[PDB]
Amino acid sequence: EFMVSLPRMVYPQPKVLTPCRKDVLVVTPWLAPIVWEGTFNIDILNEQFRLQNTTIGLTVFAIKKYVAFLKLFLETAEKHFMVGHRVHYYVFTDQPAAVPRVTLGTGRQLSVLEVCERRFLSEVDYLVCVDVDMEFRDHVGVEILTPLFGTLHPSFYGSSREAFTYERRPQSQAYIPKDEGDFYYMGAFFGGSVQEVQRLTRACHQAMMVDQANGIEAVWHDQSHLNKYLLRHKPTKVLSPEYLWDQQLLGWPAVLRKLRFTAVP
Ligand SMILES: [Hg+2]
Numbered sequence: 217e218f219m220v221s222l223p224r225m226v227y228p229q230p231k232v233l234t235p236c237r238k239d240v241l242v243v244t245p246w247l248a249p250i251v252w253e254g255t256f257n258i259d260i261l262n263e264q265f266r267l268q269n270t271t272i273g274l275t276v277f278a279i280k281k282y283v284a285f286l287k288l289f290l291e292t293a294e295k296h297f298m299v300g301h302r303v304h305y306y307v308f309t310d311q312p313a314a315v316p317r318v319t320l321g322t323g324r325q326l327s328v329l330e331v332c333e334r335r336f337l338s339e340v341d342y343l344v345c346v347d348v349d350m351e352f353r354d355h356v357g358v359e360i361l362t363p364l365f366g367t368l369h370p371s372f373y374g375s376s377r378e379a380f381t382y383e384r385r386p387q388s389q390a391y392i393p394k395d396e397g398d399f400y401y402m403g404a405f406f407g408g409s410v411q412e413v414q415r416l417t418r419a420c421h422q423a424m425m426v427d428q429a430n431g432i433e434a435v436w437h438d439q440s441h442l443n444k445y446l447l448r449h450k451p452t453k454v455l456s457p458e459y460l461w462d463q464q465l466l467g468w469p470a471v472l473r474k475l476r477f478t479a480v481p
């Protein structure tokens with residue numbers, strides 16, 4: 217928590233009387249930034265995070281045929297994910313011997329765990345939880361780091377809340393009525409401090425057990441419960457769909473200046 221001074225740095229003065237974006241919302245109503253290209257100066261942010269010796273954990277589950285996605289996923293993470301910072305990849309897999317041997321940059325490591333415990337608390341400062349059937353195509357960096365973040369679902373970012381595919385059955389712990397909801401977050405990319413991520417996954421797991429005891433299974437299971445949690449425990453940042461895109465399904469709209477992390481065709 218003690219933070220050394222930034223060095224002198226030369227960059228454009230912020231413009232108080234020029235909006236950052238005129239096409240999109242860049243702050244939530246609980247004053248959490250919404251991360252779009254143009255909002256952040258990455259040099260400032262990199263300094264702040266490097267001066268804290270920040271370590272980022274990146275977790276992926278790769279079960280059965282999903283092991284095939286690891287090579288592209290890790291290679292492209294090496295090009296685009298937290299470059300310059302300490303990174304610890306945790307690959308959770310039923311096929312440890314099939315994990316590809318990917319060459320890592322300095323300060324980057326990978327653990328294979330055969331299939332949250334406290335090993336994370338001792339090893340990393342932040343945890344980022346993503347799906348493996350994806351590739352990085354542009355910068356994903358410390359601009360996302362915060363106590364708790366969710367990402368806007370790319371199919372729903374323009375939708376009204378009544379059209380969100382939340383769990384709508386009142387018998388479910390994930391239940392959200394039609395007049396509630398900020399955003400529709402996708403399960404494929406969330407994170408935060410280790411403490412906040414473990415709170416979330418603990419809460420989701422308990423709610424999911426309660427539903428199962430009541431003989432009910434939520435519509436988009438993990439994602440429905442994620443959405444309920446983030447409704448009731450507001451994220452400290454929200455990532456734009458730059459951070460979770462499918463170009464084959466959704467193209468490349470003007471509102472996206474960059475496509476950073478995308479579905480594999
Ligand atoms: Hg700006």
Ligand SMILES: [Hg+2]
Nearest residue numbers: 275343344345
């Ligand atoms: Hg995780």
Ligand SMILES: [Hg+2]
Nearest residue numbers: 419420441445
């Ligand atoms: Hg939950």
Ligand SMILES: [Hg+2]
Nearest residue numbers: 420438441442
């Ligand atoms: Hg969850």
